[PDB]
Amino acid sequence: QCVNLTTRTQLPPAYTNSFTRGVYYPDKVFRSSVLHSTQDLFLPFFSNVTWFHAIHVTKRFDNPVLPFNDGVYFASTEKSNIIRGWIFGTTLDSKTQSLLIVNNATNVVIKVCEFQFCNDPFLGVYYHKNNKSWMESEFRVYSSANNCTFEYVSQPFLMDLEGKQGNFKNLREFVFKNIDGYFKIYSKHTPINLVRDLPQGFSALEPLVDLPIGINITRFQTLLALHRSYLTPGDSSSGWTAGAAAYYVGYLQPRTFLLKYNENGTITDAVDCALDPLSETKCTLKSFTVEKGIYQTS
Amino acid sequence: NFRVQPTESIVRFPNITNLCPFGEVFNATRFASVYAWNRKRISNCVADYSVLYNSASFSTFKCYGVSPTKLNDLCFTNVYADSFVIRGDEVRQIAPGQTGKIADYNYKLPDDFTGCVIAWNSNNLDSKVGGNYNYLYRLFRKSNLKPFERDISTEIYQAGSTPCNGVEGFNCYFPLQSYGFQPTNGVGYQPYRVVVLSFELLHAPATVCGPKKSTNLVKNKCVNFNFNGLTGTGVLTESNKKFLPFQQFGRDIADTTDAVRDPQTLEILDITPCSFGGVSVITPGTNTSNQVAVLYQ
Amino acid sequence: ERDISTEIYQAGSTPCNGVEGFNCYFPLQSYGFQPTNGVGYQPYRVVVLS
């Protein structure tokens, strides 16, 4: 069904900086001690991206429909799994084949049907009193479905449905790219331990799967979730909670990057060729130990 | 030059072949009429039309357009399977470029149809004695039915202009009559399960194409091989190092391709040709010696 | 070169070549030139001088 929410007070998003993020394998070919320069959609280093928040401690629940660009680096630091799935499409009104990749606790359902999306869809998790458990009951994702073009049921993945107010423990790195109608997903999980900003660790994302859905993706929206409790009536108005989750939304840009491979085929360093004047010289000379002597740029 | 030509050419693209559910629609319980055919989407599987042509179980396997052995190599996008029961003489009407009654008012087919029409004899699947009061068909219509369009309208055909109170009578024929399916009949009025395959080609990648034959496993041979597009000729020797469990090919320090992973055994194998140098000759003067010596580089 | 083979073509199973049978079509097809057709369906006497 479609149960809208009451106009509440939101918080303005912050602005964080990236520390070597949005780096993945540009190809599925093994390399060792080679320095090649390819054209792949990557993320520029030392960039100011938008920092969205969703902590209940107030009533923060922002989910705008930003236009989908060429390559979106979705970095979400969730300790209790608040963000369920994501939606993709153009108009989202039971008129075009919209892509729905939801990650429910029951299973992974990826259906590309004409789902009638509401004004502000979310997920409702009811808290039972007879037993200490957290199960999802409200499925306010789509009103109804008509024709379908691709339906796949993956392996069941159990998630956490208990919203807490602690620090982040797990980092879910995802990259969504829609080039030539093909949807490429880059899933990579890595445990972290921080409270703000981005970690200084290296980015090494692996490609998940490539489903040739062949649709036109224009706008997207991050589907969040809501929790219930015995102290609240449970209505979708103002008496509920959303936990605490901070995800980073970064748009990729076509920049030439110089990939470095070791003796095991694992990328350990990424030198950009379009950022700082010092980093641009190492990309042209194809080296990393710049000594004395004058050099030429362009 | 001292080169060694390859003697074998192994081709191995797939690992697990899954046949499309073709026997489910053929050996089903019952279908429907010709004016209300059931459209079934068959995709996400490796098709194999070679096991049905040599089965010697169909009554009429004549397909128009392309050859029956050439459609297995052509790749399609989405194949739609429609099944309906008609008469014996109405089988030839279901063909691209035909016209009459069934192919004009019941189920019209395009002129440039890529797919063909196959059927087989059935005398126990849906035939009974004493007549048939289940299957129906369409007779007349106000306009011609467009291809790939179902008909479930039970209206009354208005031929003339005399008021008939919406009932069958004067200038008000009923284009919904029952068939006479009987096993004691001749070539006409006999139930025939007809299944038409619609071959559609679009911009989507191939996923319903024909089968992909794979050869046996062989190593330590300087023959030609095509491993997932990589056409190389060399000795498939062993490799002590391993690759990442998500890659396929592999380069080296010479910025060339010479290492491929076996998709049938997940074993790292290196490519090493058996052609090095040419042929060198040594002649210490012709007028002083009549003996030569072949030198290898 | 020149060939005047008037045998039956075999496609897949069911061999022909005299015995005929199913899936045995005649390769030699008739033109069917008629004056009531169009200009494209008219016979053209082509003389090639090599």
Curated annotation (Swiss-Prot), chain B:
Q: What is the effect of changing E168D?
A: Increased replication in human TMEM106B overexpressing cells
Q: What is the effect of changing K101N?
A: In strain: Beta/B.1.351, Omicron/BA.1, Omicron/BA.2, Omicron/BA.2.12.1, Omicron/BA.2.75, Omicron/BA.4, Omicron/BA.5, Omicron/BQ.1.1, Omicron/XBB.1.5, Omicron/EG.5.1; May enhance affinity to human ACE2 receptor
Q: List the disulfide bonds.
A: C20-C45, C63-C116, C75-C209, C164-C172, C222-C274
In which organism is this protein found? Severe acute respiratory syndrome coronavirus 2
What result follows from mutating L52I? Answer: In strain: Omicron/XBB.1.5, Omicron/EG.5.1
Name assigned to this protein: Spike protein S1
Q: What happens upon changing F170V?
A: In strain: Omicron/BA.4, Omicron/BA.5, Omicron/BQ.1.1
Effect on the protein upon substituting T60A: In strain: Omicron/BA.2, Omicron/BA.2.12.1, Omicron/BA.4, Omicron/BA.5, Omicron/BQ.1.1, Omicron/XBB.1.5, Omicron/EG.5.1
Indicate the impact reported for Y189H: In strain: Omicron/BA.1, Omicron/BA.2, Omicron/BA.2.12.1, Omicron/BA.2.75, Omicron/BA.4, Omicron/BA.5, Omicron/BQ.1.1, Omicron/XBB.1.5, Omicron/EG.5.1
Segments for region (Immunodominant HLA epitope recognized by the CD8+) = 132-140
Q: What function is annotated for this protein? A: Attaches the virion to the cell membrane by interacting with host receptor, initiating the infection. The major receptor is host ACE2. When S2/S2' has been cleaved, binding to the receptor triggers direct fusion at the cell membrane. When S2/S2' has not been cleaved, binding to the receptor results in internalization of the virus by endocytosis using host TFRC and GRM2 and leading to fusion of the virion membrane with the host endosomal membrane. Alternatively, may use NRP1/NRP2 and integrin as entry receptors.
Q: What is the effect of changing Q297H?
A: In strain: A23.1
- Gene, per the UniProt record: S
Which positions does UniProt annotate with glycan attachment? T7, S9, N15, N27, N287
Q: What is the effect of changing L136Q?
A: In strain: Omicron/BA.2.12.1
Effect recorded for Q177N: Reduced host ACE2-binding affinity in vitro
Swiss-Prot record, chain C:
Q: What does this protein do?
A: Attaches the virion to the cell membrane by interacting with host receptor, initiating the infection. The major receptor is host ACE2. When S2/S2' has been cleaved, binding to the receptor triggers direct fusion at the cell membrane. When S2/S2' has not been cleaved, binding to the receptor results in internalization of the virus by endocytosis using host TFRC and GRM2 and leading to fusion of the virion membrane with the host endosomal membrane. Alternatively, may use NRP1/NRP2 and integrin as entry receptors.
The source organism is Severe acute respiratory syndrome coronavirus 2 (2019-nCoV)
Tell me the outcome of changing E20D: Increased replication in human TMEM106B overexpressing cells
Residue numbers spanned by region Receptor-binding motif? 1-44
Q: Where is this region: Disordered?
A: 1-26
Please give the positions of the paired cysteines in each disulfide bond.
C16-C24
Record annotation: effect of changing Y41H: In strain: Omicron/BA.1, Omicron/BA.2, Omicron/BA.2.12.1, Omicron/BA.2.75, Omicron/BA.4, Omicron/BA.5, Omicron/BQ.1.1, Omicron/XBB.1.5, Omicron/EG.5.1
Full-sequence portion shown in this chain = 465 to 514 of 1273
Q: Which domain of life is it from?
A: Viruses
What mutagenesis or variant effect is reported for V19A?
Increased resistance to neutralizing antibodies
Substituting Q34R results in: In strain: Omicron/BA.1, Omicron/BA.2, Omicron/BA.2.12.1, Omicron/BA.2.75, Omicron/BA.4, Omicron/BA.5, Omicron/BQ.1.1, Omicron/XBB.1.5, Omicron/EG.5.1
Mutagenesis / variant outcome for changing E20Q: In strain: Kappa/B.1.617.1
Q: How does it assemble?
A: Binds to host ACE2. RBD also interacts with the N-linked glycan on 'Asn-90' of ACE2. Cleavage of S generates a polybasic C-terminal sequence on S1 that binds to host Neuropilin-1 (NRP1) and Neuropilin-2 (NRP2) receptors. Interacts with host integrin alpha-5/beta-1 (ITGA5:ITGB1) and with ACE2 in complex with integrin alpha-5/beta-1 (ITGA5:ITGB1). May interact via cytoplasmic c-terminus with M protein. May interact (via N-terminus) with host bilirubin and biliverdin, thereby preventing antibody binding to the SARS-CoV-2 spike NTD via an allosteric mechanism.
Please give the name of this protein.
Spike protein S1
- Provide the organism lineage as a comma list: Viruses, Riboviria, Orthornavirae, Pisuviricota, Pisoniviricetes
- Per UniProt, what does mutating Q29Y do? Reduced host ACE2-binding affinity in vitro
